Amino acid sequence: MISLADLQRRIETGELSPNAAIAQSHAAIEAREKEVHAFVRHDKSARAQASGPLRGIAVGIKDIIDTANMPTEMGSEIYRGWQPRSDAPVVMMLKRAGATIIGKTTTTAFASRDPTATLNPHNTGHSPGGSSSGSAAAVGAGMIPLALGTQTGGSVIRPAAYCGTAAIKPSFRMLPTVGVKCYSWALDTVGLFGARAEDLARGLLAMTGRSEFSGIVPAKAPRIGVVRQEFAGAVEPAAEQGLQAAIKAAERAGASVQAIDLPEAVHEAWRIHPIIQDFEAHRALAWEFSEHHDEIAPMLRASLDATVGLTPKEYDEARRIGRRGRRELGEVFEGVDVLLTYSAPGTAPAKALASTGDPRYNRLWTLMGNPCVNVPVLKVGGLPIGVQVIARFGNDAHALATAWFLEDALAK
Amino acid sequence: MISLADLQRRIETGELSPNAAIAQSHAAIEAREKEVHAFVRHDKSARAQASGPLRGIAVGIKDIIDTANMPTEMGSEIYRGWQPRSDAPVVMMLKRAGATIIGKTTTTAFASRDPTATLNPHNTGHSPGGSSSGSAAAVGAGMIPLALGTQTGGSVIRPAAYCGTAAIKPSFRMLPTVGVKCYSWALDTVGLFGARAEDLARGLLAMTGRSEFSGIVPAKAPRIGVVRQEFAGAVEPAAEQGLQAAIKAAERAGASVQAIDLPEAVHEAWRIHPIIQDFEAHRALAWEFSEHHDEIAPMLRASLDATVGLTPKEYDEARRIGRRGRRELGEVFEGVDVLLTYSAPGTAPAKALASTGDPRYNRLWTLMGNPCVNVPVLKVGGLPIGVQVIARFGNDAHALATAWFLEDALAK
């Protein structure tokens, strides 16, 4: 994988040139695309910009995010050839910083469950996860130092974990979703994929200009609360293996680790995430569902068909439950700086299963809104397994800080 | 003006066919559009649907709201001929209910200060207000029974007041802003224009399906708290003359009216509204500002050029202030059911002033999120004057109930 922070430092000292950095990404891409299929379209003519902290940084953009010079097909036939007039605000944040938009990464149809053709970089016989399939895969295959994705359920954390890349789903609404195809407005959150936590930090600093992402250093003796999300069901052995490995490393590094049970209100918030997501999806994708029903990919079409009956009443009640969940979750962070849990059920599912993985260990946090970060831990049978670091809402800096601490802890 | 609820009842009893109702609107638009210029595009072929609570109901759509069959030009030359791929979710809410999208109404460029060519129905030498200019004017000229607009500051309540129409900016985020050109995601709220409060209720019921909008009837002896927003400065005589008339009509109607101050926190919220708005505008209109700067309308171009320096730091601090204001405001609603205040600084400005009016008496409530309804009170020099009925967040039903109450109280 390519380190954004690495490229930055070298270019800044003159040690490495932007054109060279970009040329490298173009090389890495052409080197494995025929094998990974992480891009809907690759702009081979994309070149480095002249200035900005991100000059010389190639960035892949999930194809539900608007770009003005490349089509934005939403991973759907309904939008084949669709060309937005403008670049999405998050895309502009990168461009204004000097980044190079090297291509549009694959996305499942409307960022839902329908598998793309993209394959896991670590094993072509396995799914790279979803829905930000191309972004996680491209970064995991070492094609680019940065990629944007989105998460409604678990579309950022899960595929990152499956592909062994670092990634962060910032605090809800921090990054604008304007120009980003909506699934559920109460949930949709933009996310970033990179090699390490530090790369994610330099990325957000350039995009937002917020001091909090400047000068981030590994956390010292973090106070970690371990949550296995029992309400999410039985986890797979590999996932638990990763979590224990992370806990062990963290302890040896000086962190105070303690297992904790999540409030009843939070368990409920996890239960009603589907209600909010699906009720809103029907409104957000109303035009497609009413005018191009049969054209909607099979899995999403089925999930929508099964939920046409969700009521405004149960939906309003679900959101009420969500708020109670948030309010009680904040109390949990009075004794711990971060929470640590699974990033996925286990290793990435074989492509034959035709599944991008179950987001059950991811969804709660998208609804709570807290910043979440995936920390690669180990590999079982050659497939990556990671852990999820979560901080208090609005504390993305500390999340990245602790994720870093964790990365080095595992490095012995 | 055309009443949506009336058409609804006459259509439901079989007295009026959906086709005749729509033919009515086409003719009403044809009769005044040449003098009002309220539509960017009038789809003369638009037909009525056979079923649904809104069958036979023509609706005008502010042109920053996506439509799949008609262009969405954002009131800017930058989007001349721009054609969205899908209908925005709110448009679909209307269509699924059986409504007819009769055309796109004028909007100032990107919903800001730059005046449209639309003229006030009551006196073509005056502004119809903005930024939802055409929606207010069209309903005010008796062309259509319903129209959608948006509000970031006062784009719904102010033009409604200027044009003498009923209107509502529902609770923040109740209606999705998906497919609605963003100016400020922290503020943008979709609103509705209609003949009377009851028409707005029927519209929201059909659009949302929420029981709170079903069975709405005039409120009784409501508890009104008069707020003059002194922080915004004194208003023009006409505006005060209208408020005094409303208070008196309500009292003589059986309501208990009491002047009240607004928490210092609430005053500060009003102050930092421009910070949130303009900071986000730069992010939201990044592509336009960066790639088509000189093409942005003069006034918006000037305001953006003047706020390029707003920093993430002052921005974040402004939001904290806004949240604090939201809390301390909820308290105010403990003894009072609804607040009564000004809808605009006074009568509609003369077109010669090249101004859609000052949003100073509207901006606070958009940041607070509360549901606001404009109630036409009287006319000074032939120009409408209205008052703004405000309820607690989420209590839109009551806002409409109290507005219907005020309308009757004014009719004596």
Q: Collapse the DSSP code of A321 into the 3-class scheme (helix H, G, I; strand E, B; otherwise coil) and give the result.
A: helix
Q: Is there a contact between A199 and A145 (Cβ–Cβ < 8 Å)?
A: yes
State how far residue B183 is from chain A, nearest Cα, in angstroms: 10
Q: Among all residues of chain A, which has the CA nearest to that of B313?
A: A210
Distance of alpha carbon A149 from alpha carbon A155, whole angstroms: 8
Compare all CA atoms of chain A with the CA of B282 and give the residue at the minimum distance.
Answer: A89
Q: Which two tokens stand for residue B412?
A: 């004596």
User: Is the Cβ pair A82, B87 closer than 8 Å?
Assistant: no
Chain A contact set for B177 (CB, 8 A):
185
Residue in B92, B210, B291 closest to A286 by CB: B92
Amino acid at A380: V
Helical (H) or strand (E) element with B276? helix B264-284
Q: Please choose, from the candidates B59, B277, B63, the residue with its C-alpha nearest in 3D space to the C-alpha of residue B153.
A: B277
Give the DSSP letter string of A94-122.
HHHTT-EEEEEE---GGGSS---S--BTT
Whole-number Cα distances in Å, A263 to A187, A257, A332: 21, 19, 8
Q: What is the DSSP letter of B180?
A: B
Q: Which phi and psi (to 5°) does residue A311 adopt? A: -100, 155
Please check whether residue B58 is in contact with residue B46, taking contact to mean a CB–CB distance below 8 angstroms.
Answer: yes
Give the span between the Cα atoms of B193 and A60, in whole angstroms.
43
Residue where the block lists tokens 């003498």: B164
Instruction: Answer whether B178 sits within 8 Å of A284, measured CB to CB.
Output: yes
CA distances for B396 relative to A260, B11, B202, B211, B267, angstroms = 41, 26, 13, 12, 23
Question: What distance in Å separates the CA atoms of residue B396 and residue A178, rounded to the nearest whole number?
Answer: 26
Nearest by CB to B286, from A79, A96, A291: name it. A96
Name chain A contacts of B85, Cβ cutoff 8 Å: 79, 82
Residue of A nearest to B205 (CA): A312
Residues of B in contact with A211 (CB under 8 A): 312-313
- If you compute the radius of gyration of chain B from its CA atoms, what whole number of angstroms results? 20
Nearest CA in chain A to B67: A287
Q: Beta strand A372-380 with A166-169: parallel, antiparallel or unpaired? A: antiparallel
Q: Which two tokens stand for residue A274?
A: 């589907």
Q: How far is CA A400 from CA A8, A390, A408, B23, in A?
A: 18, 9, 12, 61
Q: Which residues contact B54 (CB under 8 A, 6 or more apart)?
A: B8, B94, B97, B98, B99, B203, B206
Question: Computed from CA positions of residues B345, B346, B348, B354, in that sequence, does the dihedral angle turn out positive or negative?
Answer: negative
**Residues of B in Cβ contact (< 8 Å) with A313:** 210-211
Residue B177: CB partners within 8 Å, gap ≥ 6? Answer: A185, B150, B185, B188, B189, B190
User: Per the omega criterion (within 30 degrees of 0), is the bond before A131 cis?
Assistant: yes
In chain A, where the domains are located: 1-412
Whose structure tokens read 């056979």?
B50
Burial of residue A99 (number of CB atoms within 10 Å: 0-12, 13-18, 19+): buried
Q: Is B113 helix (H, G, I), strand (E, B) or coil?
A: coil
What is the CB neighbour count within 10 angstroms for residue A373?
32
The residue with tokens 């050839």 is: A81
Residues of A in contact with B92 (CB under 8 A): 283, 286-287, 290
Q: What angle (nearest 5°) sits at the alpha carbon of residue B92, between those of residues B86 and B93?
A: 155
Written as six digits, the tokens of A330 are 């904040």
Mapped onto helix, strand or coil, the DSSP state of residue A88 is coil
User: Is residue B159 helix, strand or coil?
Assistant: helix
Across the interface, of B87, B284, B291, the residue whose CB is closest to A178 is B284
Cα gap B352→A52, rounded to integer Å: 45
Q: Tell me how close the Cα of B305 comes to any Cα of chain A, in angstroms.
A: 16
Spatial distance between the Cα atoms of A241 and A380, rounded to a whole number of angstroms:
9
Could you give the CA distance from residue B155 to residue B168 in angstroms, rounded to a whole number? 11
Rounded Cα distance between A395 and A212, Å, is: 9
B302: CB partners within 8 A, 6+ apart: none
- Specify the length of chain B in residues: 412
Residue B200, SS3 per DSSP: helix
Please give the angle made by the CA atoms of B111, B114 and B115, to the nearest 5 degrees: 100
ω before B131 within 30° of 0 (cis)? yes
Which residue of chain A is at minimal alpha-carbon distance from B284? Answer: A89
Of B15, B1, B23, B391, the closest CA to residue B212 belongs to B391
Positive or negative torsion for Cα A378, A380, A382, A385: negative
Nearest to A283 among B89, B182, B316 (CB): B89
A283 contacts in B (CB within 8 Å)? 89, 92-93, 176, 178
Q: Note if the bond before A184 is cis, omega within 30 degrees.
A: no
CB pairs under 8 A between A and B: 83
Which candidate from B79, B93, B211 shows the least CB-CB separation from A313? B211
Q: In the PDB record, what is the listed experimental method?
A: X-ray
Taking the alpha carbons of B145, B149, B151, B155 in that order, is the dihedral positive or negative? negative
**How far is the C-alpha of B201 from the C-alpha of B207, rounded, in Å?**
10
Q: What is the DSSP letter of B215?
A: T
Could you tell me if A280 and A339 are in contact, meaning their C-beta atoms sit under 8 angstroms apart? Answer: no
| Residue B125 neighbours by CB distance under 10 Å | 12
Who among A96, A185, A313 is closest to B176 (CB)? A185
How far apart are the two ends of chain A, measured CA to CA in Å? 20
What is the maximal distance between C-alpha atoms in chain A?
Answer: 61
Q: Are A162 and A348 in contact (CB under 8 A)?
A: yes
- Rounded to whole angstroms, how far apart are CA atoms A411 and B6? 73
Residues of B in Cβ contact (< 8 Å) with A97: none
> What gap in Å lies between CA B335 and CA B330, rounded to an integer?
10
Residue A58 CA, chain-centre distance (Å), reads: 18
**Closest CB to A178 among B91, B96, B185:** B185
Q: Which of B161, B81, B109, B148 is nearest to B349 (CA)?
A: B161
Strand partners, A154: none
CB neighbourhood size of B254 (10 A): 11
C-alpha span between B153 and B160 (Å, rounded):
13
Half-sphere exposure of B288 (CA within 13 A, CB side): 23
Best mutation target among B92, B188, B319 (most A Cβ atoms within 10 Å) is B92
Work out whether strand A256-259 and strand A223-226 pair parallel, antiparallel, or are unpaired.
parallel
Q: Which is nearest to B163 in space by CA: B144, B190, B188?
A: B144
Question: How far apart, in whole angstroms, are the C-alpha atoms of residue B102 and residue B48?
Answer: 9
A173/B185 touch (CB, cutoff 8 Å), yes or no: yes
Cα Rg of chain A (Å, integer): 20
Task: Tell me which CATH homologous superfamily contains domain A1-412.
Answer: Amidase signature (AS) domain (3.90.1300.10)
For chain A, the residues whose C-beta falls within 8 A of a C-beta of chain B are: 68, 79, 82, 85-87, 89, 91-93, 95-96, 173, 176-178, 182, 185, 208-211, 280, 283-284, 286-288, 290-291, 311-313, 316
Q: How far is B73 from chain A (nearest CA, A)?
A: 11
Close Cβ partners of A254 (under 8 Å, ≥ 6 residues apart) = A220, A221
CB within 8 Å: A96 and B209:
no
CA distance B369 to A171: 21
Query: Using CB atoms, which residue from B176, B287, B311 is nearest to A284?
Result: B176
- Residues of chain B with Cβ-Cβ distance to A287 below 8 Å are 68, 86-87, 89, 91-92
Name the residue in chain A with its Cα closest to that of B309.
A209
Closest to A369 (Cα-Cα) out of A334, A325, A316 = A325
Q: Which residues pair with B338 in a beta bridge?
A: B224, B391
Contact B87 A284 (CB under 8 A): no
Q: Identify which of A146, A155, A149, A152 has the alpha carbon closest to the alpha carbon of residue A200.
A: A146
Question: CA-CA distance, B352 to B201, in Å (whole number)?
Answer: 36
How far apart are the C-alpha atoms of B112 and B304, rounded to whole Å? 11
Residue B106 near residue B140 (C-beta atoms within 8 A): no
Q: Which residue has the tokens 């009843």?
A: A264
Residue A135's contacts (CB-CB under 8 Å, 6 or more residues apart) are A38, A60, A61, A62, A105, A147, A148, A149, A159, A193
Q: Which residue has the tokens 């679909």?
A: B92
| Contact yes or no for A121/A37 (Cβ under 8 A) | no
Helix (H, G, I), strand (E, B) or coil at A123: strand
The continuous run of DSSP H or E covering A292 comes out as: none
Q: How far is A109 from chain B (nearest CA, A)?
A: 16
- Specified resolution (Å): 2.0
A209 with B182: Cβ contact below 8 A: no
Tell me the DSSP string of A301-313.
HHHHHTTTT--HH
Report the run of H or E that residue A374 belongs to, with start and end.
strand A372-380
A380 CB contacts (<8 Å, ≥6 apart)? Answer: A238, A241, A347
Q: Give the distance from residue B91's alpha carbon to the nearest chain A alpha carbon, in angstroms.
A: 9
A313 vs B286: CB contact, 8 Å cut-off?
no
Determine the distance in angstroms separating the CA of A34 from the nearest CA of chain B, rounded to an integer: 31
Structure-token pair, residue A322: 């969500």
Q: Residue A320 in 3-state DSSP? A: helix
Q: Is B398 helix (H, G, I), strand (E, B) or coil?
A: helix
Q: State whether A85 and B79 contact (CB < 8 Å).
A: yes
Contacts of A93 in chain B (CB under 8 A): 283, 286
Secondary structure E strands in A189-292: 189-194, 223-226, 256-259
Contact indicator for B388, B363 with CB cutoff of 8 Å: no
Please report how many Cα atoms fall inside a 13 Å half-sphere around the Cα of residue A123, on the Cβ side.
18
Q: What CA–CA distances, in Å, run from B19 to B13, B14, B46? A: 15, 12, 10
Mode of pairing for the β-strands spanning A338-342 and A383-391: antiparallel
Asked whether A121 and A135 are in contact (CB, 8 A), the reply is no
Q: What angle do CA A324, A329, A330 make, to 5 degrees?
A: 105
Instruction: Give the length of chain A.
Output: 412
- Residue A180 DSSP one-character state: B
Which residue, among B79, B85, B172, B174, would best test binding to A if mutated, counting the most A CBs under 10 Å from its CB? B85
d(CA B18, CA B22) in angstroms, rounded, equals 6
